[PDB]
Structure formats: structure tokens, C-alpha cells
Amino acid sequence: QSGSLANNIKKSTVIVKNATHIAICLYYKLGETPLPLVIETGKDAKALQIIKLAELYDIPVIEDIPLARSLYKNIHKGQYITEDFFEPVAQLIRIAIDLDY
Numbered sequence: 001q002s003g004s005l006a007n008n009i010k011k012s013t014v015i016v017k018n019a020t021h022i023a024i025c026l027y028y029k030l031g032e033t034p035l036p037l038v039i040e041t042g043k044d045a046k047a048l049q050i051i052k053l054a055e056l057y058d059i060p061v062i063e064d065i066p067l068a069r070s071l072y073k074n075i076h077k078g079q080y081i082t083e084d085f086f087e088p089v090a091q092l093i094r095i096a097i098d099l100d101y
Helices: 004-011 045-057 065-074 083-096
Strands: 014-018 022-027 037-043 061-063
Touching: 004 022, 004 037, 004 045, 014 045, 014 065, 014 083, 022 045, 022 065, 022 083, 037 045, 037 065, 045 061, 061 083, 065 083
Parallel strands: 014 061
Antiparallel strands: 014 022, 022 037
16 A cells, blocks of 8 residues: 555645645546546645655645635545536646646
8 A cells, every 4th residue: 555645646736735734635637537536635744744745746736725624624535526616626727737848
């Protein structure tokens, strides 16, 4: 099982956080995920680790406390986002995508 957290963060699209208390890792890939997916979540110690791994792998991290708290409560690890989050998450994905040039 070792390495699953780091591999999930490495392939992530964007992380939205509340300080070092909550981190939500979102993944969206055209043709694979039909909606953005919460691939990992962390509270406290695990949130800090997600944030450190995000730095290591150059994954964009955005602080948005109300959004991070709502996502944490509503969208469990391995679940697709629901309608209330479609537009807030789209805005994060747009800021986050690498255009690769």
C-alpha cells in the first residue's frame, strides 16, 4: 500500500485547502473521469503531508476555506463532485491546468 498517497498527489490536478487543517485533492482527466474526482483527502497531519507532497510535485494549491470545508464534508475520497461544486471546481481546474508550453 505504501506510495499510494504520493502517487495520487503526483497525478492530481489541483489541491484546495484550509490552512494545514484540511486538504482536498481533485483529479480531472479528459476521457477518463466524467467529472472531477476527489482522489485524496487529509485532515491535520495528513493535510500537511498532502501539502508537502503538492510542493514536491508542483501541484497547484489554492486556499479557499469555505470550499475546502464543504468539499471535505460532502465529497468523500473516491467520489465525483456533485452539482453544487461544478462551477467552483471548474474555476480551480482552469487556474491549475498546465498548458505544457
